[PDB]
Amino acid sequence: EPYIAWGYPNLKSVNELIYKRGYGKINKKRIALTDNALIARSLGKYGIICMEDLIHEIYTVGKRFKEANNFLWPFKLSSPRGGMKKKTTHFVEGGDAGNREDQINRLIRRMN
């Protein structure tokens, strides 16, 4: 928590990240997922064959969330275009490095 910024998203800020910055992996080689068949051919073993059924598991963390999150490549978000505040002190102490609980829904939109 000195180095990260973790909070609890709501649904459209998980709906924009999957759609815009979502990238899949088959074996290796991060691909643009961009279909319903790049998901089901490699992950239809679990019943979450399509796009929005994937995003239903990642929001209501349910049956196959380890198998669903490890499918996703880590989201390579751009730099925050609104700015940041001091970068090294905690979000309690005015900064932005740590637990912020719902102000992370603001910040996902600035990162993207």
Partner: peptide, 8 residues
Amino acid sequence: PNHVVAKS
């Protein structure tokens, strides 16, 4: 200033 500092 916000509800994160308030409950902190």
